[PDB]
Amino acid sequence: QPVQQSKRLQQTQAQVEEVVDIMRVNVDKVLERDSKISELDDRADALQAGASQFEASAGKLKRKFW
């Protein structure tokens, strides 16, 4: 149904508040994401080493005999 034309100020007022809520959700989600993206900078480096270990165990394994 048609536009809106009786209290355009309040209209924006309201129209602005909905956006505020859509953002409480986005800020929230960006938080769950800030934590997750923490366990990644860990396990990343925690695997950036898990390999830097499976390497020497080959450069030494190789170089040796087996």
Binding site: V16, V19, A44, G50, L61, K62, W66
Partner: protein, 82 residues
């Protein structure tokens, strides 16, 4: 003499207009507070997503080796023959 009863209502109407005025004011001011808020949140997303940015840059360089290791040592396990 100079006005008397006239300047009497020239005020009654003033007090009204100022009442209409502060009225409109409060609406606008109310809108402006919600907007500061929408604004504050928008600015936080951009500083947040810009932080987790470095955590996706480093988390890069470090995986820019992680598998590169299980690669350099991927072949080294070929001595499954020797």
């Amino acid at each position: 003499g100079k006005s008397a009863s006239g300047i009497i209502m020239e005020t009654q109407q003033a007090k009204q207009t100022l009442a209409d005025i502060e009225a409109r004011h409060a609406d606008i001011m109310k809108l402006e507070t919600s907007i500061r808020e929408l604004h504050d949140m928008f600015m936080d997303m951009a500083m947040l997503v810009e932080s987790q940015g470095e955590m996706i840059d480093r988390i890069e360089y470090n995986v820019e080796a992680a598998v590169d290791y299980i690669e350099t040592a991927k072949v080294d396990t070929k001595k499954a023959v020797k």
